[PDB]
């Protein structure tokens, strides 16, 4: 009599369904606390965090699998590539925003809360906010790469 | 051969399941498409298929013509 699997928000005529991986308290808590979902925070602020995390992470694959190392002294220079990819990406984001949102326009996110609490206007998703988000994404992206690289110079890690 | 043998209705139904996926994926549905994703049209398929068939045709024989000749002269 107890099923775990339920229609979304109690509405069976809408797309999604409710499952442990979608509406668990752990999943809900985790996703609500990512920088992306902090609706009430500065978009620029939210971005930098995403950049930092992402940047930092990208150095690994480039350096270890790069043509330049692989026993070739080039080493940590790869990280530099990663610094190049965050530039490409930034470009894409800037483009996505420019094209999507217009200057005058307002947000396109959804104002109703899941519970119907109409009380909430939200987000970046505006020409102004998105620019901020990408702009912060970049700064964070470059800084992420640099600090990972910085660690590379100091060394000590088992993989490289 | 893919564009020439498999036709449109199959791919249209496939894409609309992917349309569902994108909207229901967290962090990903922050980003929305400005152009609705659809399967290539019926004629467009035959054009795209023929171009591949032709490009392959021309590039394959050219690779053989030049190499077998110039390798021996």
């Amino acid at each position: 009599t107890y099923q775990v699997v339920q229609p979304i928000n109690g509405d069976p005529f809408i797309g999604s369904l409710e499952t442990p991986v979608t509406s668990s308290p752990l999943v809900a808590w985790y996703l609500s606390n990512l920088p992306g979902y902090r609706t009430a925070v500065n978009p620029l602020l939210r971005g930098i965090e995403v950049g930092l995390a992402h940047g930092f992470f990208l150095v690994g694959p480039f350096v270890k699998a790069g043509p330049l190392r692989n026993t070739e002294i080039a080493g940590q220079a790869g990280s530099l590539a990663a610094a190049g990819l965050v530039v490409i990406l930034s470009i894409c984001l800037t483009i996505y925003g420019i094209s999507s949102f217009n200057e005058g326009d307002p947000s396109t996110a959804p104002s109703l809360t899941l519970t119907g609490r109409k009380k909430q206007p939200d987000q970046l998703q505006t020409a102004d906010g998105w620019a901020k988000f990408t702009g912060g994404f970049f700064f964070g992206g470059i800084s992420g790469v640099i600090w990972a690289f910085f660690l590379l110079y100091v060394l000590d890690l088992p993989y490289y | 051969f893919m564009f020439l043998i498999s036709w449109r209705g199959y791919w249209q139904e496939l894409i609309e399941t992917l349309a569902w996926a994108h909207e229901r994926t967290p962090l990903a549905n922050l980003i929305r498409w400005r152009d609705k994703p659809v399967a290539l049209s019926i004629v467009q398929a035959r054009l795209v298929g023929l171009v591949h068939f032709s490009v392959g045709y021309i590039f394959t024989y050219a690779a053989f013509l030049i190499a077998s000749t110039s390798g021996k002269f």
Partner: peptide
Amino acid sequence: LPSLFVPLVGLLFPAVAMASLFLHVEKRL
């Protein structure tokens, strides 16, 4: 070594071109 026009044609021109086309294409007058 002029052979450093390659990336420009090889990458820069394509990136600029793509970005521009993308913008023109998504424009809504």
